[model samples]
Target: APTAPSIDMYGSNNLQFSKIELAMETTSGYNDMVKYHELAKIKVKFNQWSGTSGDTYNVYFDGVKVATGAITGSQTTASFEYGQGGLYQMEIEACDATGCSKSAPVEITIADTDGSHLKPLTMNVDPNNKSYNTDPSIVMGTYFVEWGIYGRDYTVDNMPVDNLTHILYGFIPICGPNESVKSVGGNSFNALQTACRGVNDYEVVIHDPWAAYQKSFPQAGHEYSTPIKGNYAMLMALKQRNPDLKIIPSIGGWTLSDPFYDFVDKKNRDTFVASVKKFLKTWKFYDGVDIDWEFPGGGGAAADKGDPVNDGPAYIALMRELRVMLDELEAETGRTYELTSAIGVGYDKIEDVDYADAVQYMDYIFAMTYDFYGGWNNVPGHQTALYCGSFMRPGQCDGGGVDENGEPYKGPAYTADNGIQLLLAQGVPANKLVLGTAMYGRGWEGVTPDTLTDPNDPMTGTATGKLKGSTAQGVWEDGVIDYKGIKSFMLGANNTGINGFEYGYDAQAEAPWVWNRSTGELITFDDHRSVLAKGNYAKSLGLAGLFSWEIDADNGDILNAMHEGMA
Candidate 1:
C-alpha cells in the first residue's frame, strides 16, 4: 500500500512487501516494582524475510521508535532503560527505503500482577449448612465467616483475600442465655458503645436454643424468658470484627409460636421490645434485628385461639413498635440500626400481616417461599413455584399428587406458585423481600393407598399414600440425600409406583423435577434445575438476595449451579 516502494531487489520480485515480525522480552518481569535507580533491561526483536542492501527499518516499544539500519535482518534486537511503572508493547513496520511497508504489530503486558483480567471470582458460604462446616464444595463459592462470640473463639485460614472481606464471622445470643454483659465478643454492649464503631452485619439466626445453649448454659432461663448473655457476647464479637457484617437475631422458627395476638392483647408488646432493646444494648454489636414470628393471629399450633382478622393488624403493630424503638434508639445513639423479618408461607400469615406497614419497619422481608407441597400434601409439588399453572404444565402434572404412601398417583394437587402469588398481591416491594429457598426436600414415606386409582374408573380412583411426615423428619443435612435408604424403602414396601407420579417445571418457572414413575406410589424432589429456577426468580424479582433454609437437602450441584447461574 506504500506505493509498492518502487521495489528494486535487483530482479522482478513476486512479493510486494516483506512482513516485519517484532516481539518483546522483559528482563524485568511484568508487574515488577523496581526501585528508583535499579538497572532494568527490555529486549526488542525484529525479523524480515527478504530485503535489498541499504534497506532501513524502525522498531518501537510503546511508540518510542528505534532504527535498525540493515536489510534482511535476523535476531535484530534493541535495549531500553527502565522507567516508572507503566505498560509497554512492541511494534515494528518496515518500508524498504522504497516504502513497501508491513503494518502488523505485537503487544505484551508489563505491570503489577494485580492488574489482570483473569482475577478469580470469590464466593462466601455460610457454615450453618452441612457442606460448609464439613465439605469444601460449599466453599467452592463459599466464603465463611466464623462467628465471633464473647469467649467462643473461631478463626479460618487459607483465605484468598487479605482484607478479610470474603470471610465473615457469626455469633449468637439466642443460644447464649445469661452472660449478656461480659460476653460482648469483640465489641461493646450498648448502642452508644457501638455507634463509636462500624456497621455490624452477620447471619445470626434463632432456632431451638434449648439445644444450642445446652453447652454454654446447662440451665438457660426458663422456656418463656431466656438470658441475653449469648446475644451480648455475639454482638460484642461482631462489633469488634468489621462492624459491617450483618448481626441479626432471628425469632420464631418452626417450633416457636406466633404470639403477635397474645403479645398485643396481654400488653406483652412493650416487654418484647424492651427485652430486645436490653439484649441489643448488652451486645453493642448488632446493626439490627430479624423477626420470624411463625403466625401473627390464627392457625398453626392447633391449640391457638386468636382472631385471624386482627392478625394483620397485630403483626403490623409489632413491626411498627420495632421500627419506632429502632428509630428512637438510633436517634439517641447516632447509629441507624436496620430491621428485617421472615414471614411464613401459609395463606393465613400472608393474609394477616400488613405487608406495606411491615415494609416500613423492615429493610428486607424474607419470604419463606418454599414448602408449598410436602409429605403433608396429598400430591408431590415443587418446593417453590413462580407461576400459577407451573404444576399443570406438561411434566409438572406429575408432581404434588403423591398419595399417603409417598407413592405417585394423582389425587388432589397444590403448587408452590400459589404461595408466591399471595405476597405479590400485597404490593410487596421486590427489593425489600428476600425469597427463601429450602436446602432440604419434603420427603414422603411409601405407603399403600386405601384404594388404588382404578385404571378403569372414569375418574382415577381417589389416590393416597402412607404419610411420611415433613421434610425435617429425614436424616439428611448439608444438602446431600439418603436416596439409597429412602428410595429402597419406598420401592420395596411402599405402594407408591404401581401407577404414576408427576414432575413440575416451566422455562419461565425456572425449575425442573421428575416424577420418577408413571403410576402408583412414587416420590419426587427438587434437583439442580429447580434450585436454579428459584435463584433465577430471586434475581428477576430484584429481591434483597436469596437464601436457603438448611443446606443438607440439595444435590451439591443445586447450590453450585445456582450461584453460578445467578445474574
Candidate 2:
C-alpha cells in the first residue's frame, strides 16, 4: 500500500504548529482579552504558511470547535465569542491535504460581569444608567498639590472640579524642630490661593504637617506657633468661595513619619490628640485630620523609626482616640470633623495593623497601592499595573512574600487588584477603602535592548536613573516622569513618534511600557486604559471610590477615563 501522502509538517512533529494571537478587539491593534459585559468576543489570527491550497484551519474554544475555514494563502483568521466567566483555553488545529497539526493552547480569563461577587446596592452602577443613584457612601477624590501647579502648569482654575468630589491638597510639612506647621511661602502659597479661588463643590483636604523633621516646640523661622497661624490662616481663607468645603489635614509622609511613633506612644498620645483638636479649634479652617503615617508598622523609608510590631496597634489606638476627640470637638463647636488616613500598600504593613479595627474609627482608608515597583528594582517594571502579567514569577504578584527592591524580581505577579484583594481578605470593608492610582511613571536607564523585544528581560543594577528636576516641559523629572511629560516622552517631540523608543502593551499585566532600542531606557507608567480598568474594578468591588496621586498628572485624560469607567 502506498504511504499516506503528507505535506511539509513544517519539518516538525505532525502535531507541531505555529502560534495563535488572540485579541479581544479588532486585529488591527494588539491587545489582551478584557471581559466586557456578559460575553467576550475575541478575534483569533495565525500564520498558515505551511498549509496547502485545499487546507483548512479549525479554532477551538476549550476543546470545542467554534470556527473552521479554508487556510487561504499565508494566514488564517476567525472570531469566537465565549459566554463563560472562568479561564478558557483557545487552540488552533490546522489540516493540510496530507496531514494535521495542533497549536499550543492559549488561556484567557474572563471576569464575572453579573455582579455576582458584588453587593446588591446600586452605588456601583453607571451614573447615567437607570440603575444609578447619588448615594452618600461613594467617594470620588483626587490629590491636589501646590507644586503641581508650578511644575506641571496645572492650576486649580483649570482643574476638572465637576468631575471630582474631594481634593486632597498635598502636602505641608511638619517642622519636627519646632513641632508646628511649616510656613506656606512663595509659589506654594500662590498655588493654594489659586486652587481656593475655583468655584466647585469639592471637599478641600489640607494634607499637611509632613514629618520631614521632628519638633518639640513651635519656632519662629521653621514653623508657626501652635495657635495655628500662617498657612492655617491662608488655607482657611479659601472658605470664602466655597464655605461648605471640607478642609482636612494629612499628617505624616514617607520622609516625615518618624515623629508618629512618639505621638502615638502612651506618654504623648493624649497630648498629640489634644494638640490636633486644639489646632482645629483655634482655627475653624480645618474640618478634620487625615493621618498619613507613611506606614504604621515600618516597611517604609530606611529612616522610619516606628516599631514595626506595635505601630499597627499604636495606629489603631491613635485613630480611635483622635476620632473621639474630633467628635467631642464637633459636639462642642457644632461642626463636624471627618477623619481619614493614607494607608500603606505593603501587605506586611497592612498585616501589622488591624485595618478592620482601625477603619471603623475613620471615614475611609486611602490604599496607597500605586508604588508597588519603582527605580529601586534591579529590573524595569510596571510601577502600577492593573494585573500581574505572564512575566511575573511565583510569589511576585500576590502582593506579599519578598520585597521586589531587595530581591531580583520577575514581575512578582503583583497588581493593584492584589493589594485590594489582600486588604479585603484582611477584613477591611470595601466601602472603607479608596483605591489609589498614580499620575506618574517610574523609569530606568541603561536597560538591555532585549527589553524592547521583551519587557520581562532580566535587569541588573548596573543601569539606573533619578529625579533631577523638572524636565524641559517643567512637568517631570528623570526617574519620576509626570503623566503629562510621559505623553511627550512616549509620543516624542511635537507628538509625532515614539521618541527613540517603541511602545507596547502587556495584555496579561494590563499595562503599557516604553523602551528605547538605542539608549536602553525603559519606562512603565499608568495611562487612561489602566486607570479605567482600576476604576471599574473599584466599582465592581463596591469600594468608596478611586483617588489619583495628584489631580493634574494626566491633563485630565486618566481622570476622565476613570470617571467614565466607574460610571
Candidate 3:
C-alpha cells in the first residue's frame, strides 16, 4: 500500500486502504458473442459499493491492464474488443486516491460467426472419445437429406441446434457405372455446408452413396477416381469448421442394398474392407463407416431380390468384418471410428439380421420404425403410429406371430413400441437402439364417403390408401406429403372444420389424421402429438436416442416435439 502525501509532517496525512468492494451488473464468468463483421465490445458496468465516488478502477483482459477511470455516480464502465475466435478472462481493480482493491475475474469467449476464423480440416473424429456408455441419457439425431427430394427448402441453417444431438447427412450417391462413390447436385451440397458448419458438440454423419454399390476402388491400387469428389469433399470442408463433428460414410439403402451381398461375400469382404479403409484415409474427413443395408435376409426394392437368402447371416459377418477393419484403422490413425446401421422394423427383417451378435460389433442401430403402413395398405392406417389403433383389418392388425383367426403373420402389429420391442426381444441392447421418426405424412385418396365415418375403422379395396399421391397442393407427389407442406397447405391457418377438412386424433394410435367429407380424402401422418408420444416412449425405454427420416419434412414442429418429449 502506498502512503498518502505527508503535508504537515506529523504523520497525519498517512491513510489506510480499506477493501473497495466492486460488483458487476453483468453476471461474472459468463460468455457472450459478437457477429464476425462487427467490432467486439463489452460494456461492463460496475458498482463501487464501499468506495468513495471518486474511486478509480483499472480493467484488465486476462490480467493485462486495458483501461483506468474514476467511478461515475457509483458505477464505472469499460469496453474491450477482440478479433477472430478465442476465450479470454476479464477483471477489474478498484482504488481510492489512497489504495486499491481487487475484483474477481470473469471469462469471455468470442467466436467468428461470419466465417472469419474458420479453416476447414481433413480429419475430425476423436477416436478415443468415440466409445461411450450404452445407456446414454438421451440420443437426438436427424436425417439431413432424402432421395429425389421435393419438399420444403429446409437448409442447414433451418436446423435447430438445440433440437438435434446428431445430424445424418443423407444419400451421397454411389455410381453404378464406375463403381465409385460421389455426390451430385451443387445446390444441395452447398446447402449441406451451411447446415454442418454452424453446429457444435454434435455429430455429422454422411448417410453415404445410397441404394447401390459400385466398387469404385480397384484391387490394384485401392484408389478412388476423381469423379468420386462429391460428398466427401464437402464433408471434409465441414470438418474444418467443426473438428469435433464426425463425418461417417454410410453405405447402402433401399435401392443399393442388393450389392451388399457381393460386398459382404467372403471373397470380397477383405477387398471391401481394404478399399473402405483406404477410402477413409483418402477422405480424411470420415470419422467412421455406417452400413445401411436396408434389410439383409431379403425384402427391399424389387431389384434387391437377387440378394442371397442367407443374407441375414452374411450381414452379421459383414458387420463383424467392418468392426474389425474399423478397429484396425483406429489403431493406425489413433482415432476410434464409429460403426452403425439402419435396420428394419419388420419382424422378418429383424429376424434376417443377427442383431444379438451384430449389434455387438456396431455402435447403434436406427430402427426404421416409420413406414409401418403406407400407400400399399388395404385401408388408410397410421404410417408411423405410436401404438396399435383398434382399427380391425383382420390381416393387417394381427400381431407378428399369429392372426385373430390363428394364421401366420409377417410383420409385427405396426407401432413404434412394437418395433423397438421386437429389436429388444432379439437381444439388441437398448443403448444401441435409436428409434426413427418420419417427418412426412402418408395419405390415401378416393376414399368412400361412407367408409370415412369412423377414423378408427379400416377402409378396404379402392378406398384403400394409394402411394405417392397428394390430396392437396405442395411439394409432393403420389400419396405422400412432407410435414411442412401438410402444415401450411393441408392444415391452413383457418379451417371450417367440415368441407375444408378438419383434423382428428386417434387416442389409441397417438397419431393425427385429416379427413374432408367434401372430397372423401383421408391422410394419416405424424404431427407434434404423435412425435411427442414416440419420443416419450423411446425415453421411457431408455433407448439410445430419437432420429427422424429427414429434417426438411417438418416446419420445426416435429423436432420441437422430439426435444420436448425427450426432455
Candidate 4:
C-alpha cells in the first residue's frame, strides 16, 4: 500500500511568480468564485514521502492528471499551474509496485493583479449546501482579542467560526476618564484608551476603533459597502456566512477591567445599561455581551481594582440591570440577545459575586478554568490540570497552594477541577457554565527538574527554578509559547518530548505536561487529549461546551481537537 504525503502548510503556499504575492491574498476576492484579469503563479510544497523507491507522482488538478514527477521517497517540492483565475482543488497521486494511493487535496486560487474575490473562504459548509449554526445545545466560545491584529497578524477571517458557537471580542471598556484606568500604567497607557477620552464612564465603547472598525482588511469584504470595517465588518459578514456563530463584545479584561467597579455603581447603573444597549444596537454583528470583569471585588489586573465589600453586591446588581436591557433589546429588535459573564473560579473570586443570583440573569457563565500555574509561580506545575492531584508540592497543591511569588497561602489550588466543581457546588447551574481552555503553554526557565523532583514521588510536580523571564521564543511573549510554537517545538506538536524533555501525564489530575532536565524548562499545557478530557468532563457534568483563551494560537490542529471534544 502506498502512503499519502502530508502538506507542509508553512513551507508550501509561498509566493511563486517572481516577486511572490500572497497565496491567500495574491488574487483579489473569494478565490473560488471570481475570475482574474492576469496570470498568477503559486508554489505548493509537501513532504512525508510515501511508497517504494520507484513510486513516481502524478499531480491532479480538478481531477485531471496535469503533471507527473520522478521525485523519490523524499519528495519535497511541487508546483501548480492553472489556466483560470478562479479556485481549484489539487492533490497528489503516488504509485509504486504495491499500488497507487490518493493524497489529501489542497486548494489554491489563481487570481491576477486586478481580479477580485480576495481569498477563498471556507465556511464549513456541507456537501448538500446546507448552512449550519454552531450547536446551540452547547456553547464553544473562543476569545478574539482586538490586539491580535498587530504583532500576531491574526484576523477575524482566520478564526474557526464553525467549530465555535461564540466569538468573544477580547475587550470593550467602560467609558471613563483615561487617567482613572488603574490597571495599566505609564508608556502609552492611553494607547488603548481612546474609548475613555470622549465618552462617560457609563457607556461601553470599542477599545481599539482602528482595529475594530477603522482599518481596512481587504479580505474582510473590503471591496463592498459596510458601515464599519476591520473585525466588526468581517464579523458581521461571518455571521451571515455562518448563521450559527455569534459574536459578542467581551466587556473588560485584565487591562481594561478596572472601570467595571465604577460603572456598576447604582448612580451610574442606568447610564451603563442604556449605553450597553446602544452599543449592541449600533453594532448589528454583535449578538450579545460577555462581561470579563477579571474579578468583582479586586483580584483584578491591579491590586486595587474594586472595593472588596461593595463590589460583590454591585456585581450582582450590574448583571440584573444588564439582563433587563438585553431582554428589552431582544423585544425591540425581535431577535435573541444573550447576557453572560466570564467569571473567575477562585473561591474568593466566585464568592465575591452572588453567582446564584447572577446566573439567573445570564445565559452562560464562562468559568476561567485555565491559568492554574505559570511563570508567576516558583514551582513549575500544570496550569490547566483537570484535577487537584498530588503533583504539587506540600504548600502548592497539598491543602495549601503556594502563589507565583513562592509565598505560602491557603487559597484555591486553581486547577480546573478545583475551580469548576466549586462553581457547581456553589449553586451555579452546570448548564450555564462553560469551561475555559488555553491554546498556549506556561513553562518556567532555569529549573533543576531531575535534581529536585523524584520519580519515586512523581506526584510532587516539576522543578523549582531561578526567576528569570521566559527566554524561549513565544508566538507573542518571550516565555509564553503559543500552541503553534509549542507544536513546532515539540517535534511538530505530537508531544513526544525530544531534547531531554520528557513527556509525562498525571492520571490523577487527568492532565499533561513536559519537563526538560537539561534545558531546565517545565512547561504545562492542555493538549488534544486534555482538551478532549475537559470536553468530555463538561458533557458528563451537563455543562455548556468549552472555550479557549484566543483562537489564533492554533494552526487548525488544536481547534479541530476542540471541536472533536465538543462532539
Q: Per-model C-alpha lDDT, please?
A: 0.42, 0.57, 0.57, 0.67
Best by lDDT: 4
Q: Per-residue error at 321 for model 3, in Å?
A: 1.0
Per-prediction TM-score, please?
0.50, 0.62, 0.63, 0.71
Better of 2 and 4 by TM-score: 4
lDDT of 3 by residue, 1-567 (tens): 221111111121111101111111211110111011334444566665443544566776678886777656555555454443434565667667667665666554343321222234233222221222222357677776644223343333334533455666555322221121223345534433333343221122223222111122221111232122233333333555555555555666664454565544575666566656655654455677767776676666543353445777777887898899888988987987888888878766776666898889988898888887667654666788877775634555555356446777766676777777878888888989988888887777666656644534533323544644443454365677787667776677552233456787778778787766556566777777888888788778878888887776666677777776676
Residue 457 of model 2 has an lDDT of 46
- By TM-score, how accurate is candidate 4? 0.71
Question: Best by TM-score, which number?
Answer: 4
Positional deviation of 304 in candidate 3, in angstroms? 6.4
Best-to-worst TM-score order:
4, 3, 2, 1
Q: Which 10 residues in a row give candidate 2 its minimum summed lDDT?
A: 26-35
Q: 344 in model 1: Cα distance from truth in Å?
A: 2.7
Model 4 CA deviation exceeding 4 Å by range = 1-136, 177-188, 221-227, 393-412, 456-473, 491-494
